[PDB]
Amino acid sequence: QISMRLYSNRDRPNHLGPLALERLARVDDVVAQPARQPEDGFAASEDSLLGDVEEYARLFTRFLDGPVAPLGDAIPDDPARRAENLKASAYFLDASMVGICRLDPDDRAGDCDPSHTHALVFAVQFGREPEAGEAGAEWIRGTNAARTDMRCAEIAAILSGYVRWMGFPARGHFSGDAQVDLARLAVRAGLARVVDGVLVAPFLRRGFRLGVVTTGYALAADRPLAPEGDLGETAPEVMLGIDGTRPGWEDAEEEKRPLHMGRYPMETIRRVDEPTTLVVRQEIQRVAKRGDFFKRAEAGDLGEKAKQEKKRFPMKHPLALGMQPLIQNMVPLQGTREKLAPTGKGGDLSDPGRNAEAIKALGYYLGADFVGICRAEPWMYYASDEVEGKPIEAYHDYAVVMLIDQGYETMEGASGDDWISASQSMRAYMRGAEIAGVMAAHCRRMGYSARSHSNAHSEVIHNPAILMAGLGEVSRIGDTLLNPFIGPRSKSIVFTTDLPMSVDRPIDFGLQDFCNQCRKCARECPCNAISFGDKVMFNGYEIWKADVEKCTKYRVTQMKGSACGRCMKMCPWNREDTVEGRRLAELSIKVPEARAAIIAMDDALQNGKRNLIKRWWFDLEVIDGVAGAPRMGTNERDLSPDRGDKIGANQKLAMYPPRLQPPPGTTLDAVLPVDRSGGLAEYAAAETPAAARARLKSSA
Ligand code: B12
Ligand SMILES: *OC(=O)C1(*)(*)=[C][C@](*)(Br)=C(O*)C(*)(*)(Br)=[C]1
Ligand code: SF4
Numbered sequence: 181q182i183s184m185r186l187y188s189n190r191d192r193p194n195h196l197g198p199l200a201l202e203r204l205a206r207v208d209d210v211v212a213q214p215a216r217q218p219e220d221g222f223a224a225s226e227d228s229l230l231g232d233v234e235e236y237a238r239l240f241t242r243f244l245d246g247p248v249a250p251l252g253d254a255i256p257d258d259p260a261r262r263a264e265n266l267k268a269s270a271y272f273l274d275a276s277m278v279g280i281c282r283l284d285p286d287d288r289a290g291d292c293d294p295s296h297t298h299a300l301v302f303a304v305q306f307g308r309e310p311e312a313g314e315a316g317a318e319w320i321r322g323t324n325a326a327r328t329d330m331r332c333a334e335i336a337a338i339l340s341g342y343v344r345w346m347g348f349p350a351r352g353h354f355s356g357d358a359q360v361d362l363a364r365l366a367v368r369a370g371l372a373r374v375v376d377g378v379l380v381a382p383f384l385r386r387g388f389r390l391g392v393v394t395t396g397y398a399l400a401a402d403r404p405l406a407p408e409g410d411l412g413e414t415a416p417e418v419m420l421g422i423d424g425t426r427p428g429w430e431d432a433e434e435e436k437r438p439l440h441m442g443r444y445p446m447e448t449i450r451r452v453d454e455p456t457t458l459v460v461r462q463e464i465q466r467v468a469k470r471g472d473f474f475k476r477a478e479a480g481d482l483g484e485k486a487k488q489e490k491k492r493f494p495m496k497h498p499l500a501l502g503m504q505p506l507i508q509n510m511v512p513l514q515g516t517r518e519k520l521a522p523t524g525k526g527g528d529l530s531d532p533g534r535n536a537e538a539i540k541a542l543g544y545y546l547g548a549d550f551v552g553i554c555r556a557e558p559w560m561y562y563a564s565d566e567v568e569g570k571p572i573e574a575y576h577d578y579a580v581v582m583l584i585d586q587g588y589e590t591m592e593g594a595s596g597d598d599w600i601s602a603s604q605s606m607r608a609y610m611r612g613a614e615i616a617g618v619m620a621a622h623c624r625r626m627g628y629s630a631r632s633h634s635n636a637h638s639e640v641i642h643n644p645a646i647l648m649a650g651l652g653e654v655s656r657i658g659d660t661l662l663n664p665f666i667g668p669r670s671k672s673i674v675f676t677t678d679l680p681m682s683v684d685r686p687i688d689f690g691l692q693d694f695c696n697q698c699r700k701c702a703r704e705c706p707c708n709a710i711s712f713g714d715k716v717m718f719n720g721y722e723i724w725k726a727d728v729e730k731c732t733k734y735r736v737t738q739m740k741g742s743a744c745g746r747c748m749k750m751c752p753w754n755r756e757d758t759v760e761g762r763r764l765a766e767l768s769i770k771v772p773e774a775r776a777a778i779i780a781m782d783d784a785l786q787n788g789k790r791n792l793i794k795r796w797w798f799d800l801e802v803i804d805g806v807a808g809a810p811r812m813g814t815n816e817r818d819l820s821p822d823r824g825d826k827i828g829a830n831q832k833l834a835m836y837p838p839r840l841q842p843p844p845g846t847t848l849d850a851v852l853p854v855d856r857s858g859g860l861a862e863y864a865a866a867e868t869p870a871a872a873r874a875r876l877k878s879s880a
């Protein structure tokens with residue numbers, strides 16, 4: 181596998197994007213000409229997904245406009261910086277290409293707010309589709325303009341919302357709902373040129389769709405592409421991607437592998453029948469959803485301050501606030517628990533092996549980074565809901581599990597617990613919920629009960645499903661599983677379904693041995709919540725149990741950022757997607773004698789250092805509905821020194837297995853103060869995985 185970047189983007193600012201657009205021939209202006217956006221070649225069947233992407237696009241269309249916050253005193257005046265920040269924001273949300281142009285009076289002449297002076301124009305490339313006769317092609321064929329339009333609506337809704345929260349009027353636009361000429365602005369803003377009356381964008385050879393955010397927030401504008409001849413797309417520097425940009429051969433190489441296999445070579449990872457850590461199903465008790473520690477915080481179990489801050493902590497930054505409406509309003513579309521009758525739609529659904537591939541291909545098409553499938557075992561479901569306290573049924577047979585990468589480059593510039601941390605969480609949550617909502621819906625159209633399980637609302641615990649789906653191994657971080665290619669840098673989305681699918685198997689890439697000789701995450705945790713010691717048994721399975729009380733308290737109540745995820749940032753497996761980055765992961769996996777050295781050199785080379793070039797976001801905290809400079813400051817953490825040879829023996833953490841949780845009937849209306857002293861003792865009394873194995877062997 182040769183398609184990864186040879187060159188690092190460490191010195192590339194985020195506003196420049198993954199493409200070498202700065203190397204393309206440009207002119208000051210070009211003459212407008214009529215043009216339309218790319219469309220699908222083939223039309224979409226009745227047995228296709230089109231209705232579902234159209235529904236989510238309609239949902240997001242609701243947030244293209246909204247209320248404008250009061251203007252605070254903390255927004256940068258410089259339009260160049262403003263432009264950079266907004267381009268970076270759009271790339272962070274996976275715009276393919278971004279540009280900015282001035283609006284003229286023909287543009288405001290229409291329904292568009294006449295206060296609007298500038299447009300942020302972005303393109304999203306068409307998804308890859310399954311080749312003909314591949315599983316799921318008929319689900320997907322002819323849905324790409326609409327699938328891509330949904331993504332545009334989503335991005336335009338978030339970005340327009342972000343600028344409105346900074347105190348500037350702003351409106352998002354896309355094909356389904358636009359007040360301006362999208363194609364005309366794509367050309368002016370320098371993303372496309374016209375060929376035979378249709379837009380053609382350098383680099384985006386699969387076709388694409390547009391979004392726009394028009395606004396009075398003044399921005400430095402871009403220049404159009406030279407209107408004729410060669411733009412420089414194949415120049416040697418662009419082709420090799422010398423500045424850290426996407427290699428010219430990458431698209432072609434990637435199209436060589438089937439869509440259903442994903443971009444990362446997970447087929448090269450060793451599969452195993454039982455997972456790499458002990459799982460004793462007969463001893464796994466089910467947990468009240470009221471024992472989720474965010475619910476415990478919400479109910480008063482962790483004290484007043486945590487209770488107060490529980491709703492607010494991830495929504496302190498305008499960007500996150502821009503996502504909130506989409507996140508909350510997707511919840512009613514999550515789907516059904518009741519058995520459905522097969523509708524005959526969806527093609528040949530008799531091979532589970534092909535259904536698995538179809539579902540995978542579907543997820544990758546929609547933008548998942550990993551897709552894995554396991555049985556939705558009943559102990560993966562919460563025991564009861566936190567609102568009424570009613571039992572939750574194990575209503576579906578299968579879990580489809582997908583990982584959304586939280587973003588390497590952004591996190592590289594971040595402290596992990598600064599003003600962007602929750603935006604990295606919420607982006608990944610929002611994108612995952614959108615994708616799983618669409619896929620669950622499609623399953624329903626085919627007559628197979630399906631429900632997604634998001635941040636806002638899950639009735640399963642994702643972790644054991646990530647494990648059983650072969651998407652990660654247990655890591656020291658604790659309540660995070662670690663994937664061999666994106667490390668711990670993900671959020672999962674799960675949807676459960678009755679659709680028959682062949683299931684994946686657990687993976688073994690040596691992580692247990694690796695984490696046994698690493699402590700980096702533990703050392704770098706602001707509240708010392710991560711264990712420096714050995715794995716323990718906990719509710720019938722082997723785990724490194726973090727202190728979820730301390731972590732929750734820090735994430736919810738710390739005031740120098742918006743939440744925390746520093747532990748993902750500091751992990752050696754959190755690496756750049758270069759040849760060297762991949763080689764270090766391949767070595768970690770394949771060469772045990774090298775692991776200690778890799779661990780040590782991760783620190784010697786100061787990996788985890790904050791990269792000032794990558795800090796593209798504004799430090800803004802919304803207090804009382806108005807964005808301002810941070811009241812208490814901003815975490816700007818650096819690599820930390822060793823804790824000691826004896827820390828694993830001396831650190832005492834608290835654990836909260838079912839016995840110390842609110843029991844299965846309990847609702848948010850009750851308070852159960854966290855029993856920290858009992859949790860300390862519980863941990864001290866936890867059985868060792870060794871002892872457990874001996875114990876289980878004596879009943880064999
Ligand atoms: C509440 C919560 C937290 C809380 C409290 C956790 C708690 N124990 O209650 C806190 C604040 C600690 C938290 C923090 C973070 N978590 Co969190 N959070 C959850 C959430 C929303 C609910 C978990 C819950 O229901 N209560 C937990 C009850 C059941 O507690 P538990 O008995 O201790 O079980 C835990 C583990 O042992 C594991 N588990 C349960 N059964 C089994 C069985 C087996 C065999 C195994 C191996 C594991 C396992 O799942 C639970 C995770 O809390 C989930 C989403 C979800 N629906 O699963 C994520 C989730 C676990 N968080 C996630 C992440 C990434 C984080 C953070 C890195 C924050 C961030 N920026 O993204 C940190 C990491 C903390 C750490 N040191 O590991 C991801 C993990 C994804 C992954 N790659 O594995 C999840 C799945 C969200 C998502 N959709 O991706 N989180
Ligand atoms: O429920 C939540 O609000 C929430 C927020 C964030 Br930023 C993270 O990481 C989790 Br886990 C849960
Ligand atoms: S464990 Fe919780 S507190 Fe510690 S770093 Fe990871 S997220 Fe931040």
Ligand code: SF4
Nearest residue numbers: 655656695698701751
């Ligand atoms: S940092 Fe070291 S210990 Fe912590 S998870 Fe990553 S590899 Fe395992």
Ligand code: NA
Nearest residue numbers: 751752754787
């Ligand atoms: Na790293």
